[PDB]
């Protein structure tokens, strides 16, 4: 549903 997203998180 997201045009821009990643599974990775900066923490």
């Amino acid at each position: 549903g997201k045009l821009i997203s990643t599974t990775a998180v900066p923490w």
Partner: antibody
Amino acid sequence: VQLVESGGGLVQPGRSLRLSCAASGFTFNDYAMHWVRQAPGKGLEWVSGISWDSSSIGYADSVKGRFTISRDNAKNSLYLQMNSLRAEDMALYYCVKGRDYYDSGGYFTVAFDIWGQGTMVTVSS
Amino acid sequence: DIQMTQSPSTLSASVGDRVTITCRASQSISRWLAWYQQKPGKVPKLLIYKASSLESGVPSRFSGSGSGTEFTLTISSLQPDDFATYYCQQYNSYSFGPGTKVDIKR
């Protein structure tokens, strides 16, 4: 905390410009970064964005195939390469810091919390 | 493609009024909606995000509600700092509403 855009100016239709944005006062690499534009006297239009880890990029339909977003984390900088410029691309271009949120297996922007003052792009023959 | 609409397009208000303005999405956007303030010649300012979270430092007279397709921004008691245009944006694909301008009633 600040976002300083440069690279704007006067360009003829069909020519190119490269915009720059230099970020300071926050950990630039930790955040999605975006470009938003505003034509004179008009509303806001999102142009392009890039996730904190550069793995995901998006463009407005109106610019895709002509604009390229990128970031250089080592230089705390965001860029927009704009080709085949048209009169309708005339606008003040803001560099914008995203604030991101994790939901349903994905990390995505939910707010634009810091905005640069903008660099003015004039497209005219 | 998600169309964001806003109503009213303009609003005449007085200091002390409670003003509520509306934003609507053409399909469900859950709670991924933010509200921005903008004044002539100035940069937009984040007010609310995730539909109802008030941004740090923003006065508490501002509140947002809604989920799905209908969203509202409320100013419980309009202050002179608040005459401005207000935009909503959805974060599935970043389209903005066309803005609501709140000017000074006379």
